Amino acid sequence: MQYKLILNGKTLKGETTTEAVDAATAEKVFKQYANDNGVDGEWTYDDATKTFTVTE
C-alpha cells in the first residue's frame, strides 16, 4: 500500500511516498505530483519494493 516514488530529474531529485490501495491509483497520484512539478522523461516500476522511478 505504501508506494515509493524516486525523482531523478534535472531540477528535482529525491523520494516521495503515498499510501494507495492500488498501484494504478498510486501511479495516478505520482503522475499528478510529478506533472505538477514539471517532471517527466521516463517511468519505470518495480513491484518487488513497489517503487516508481521517474527519470528526467
12: domain CATH number is 3.10.20.10
Determine the residue type at 27. Answer: E
Determine the residue type at 12. Answer: L
8-28 core/surface letters (b: 16 or more CB in 10 A; e: else): ebeeeeeebebebeeeeebbe
Determine the residue type at 4. Answer: K
Experimental technique: NMR
Look up the domain containing 30 and give its range: 1-56
Nearest CA to 17 among 56, 50, 47, 55?
Answer: 50
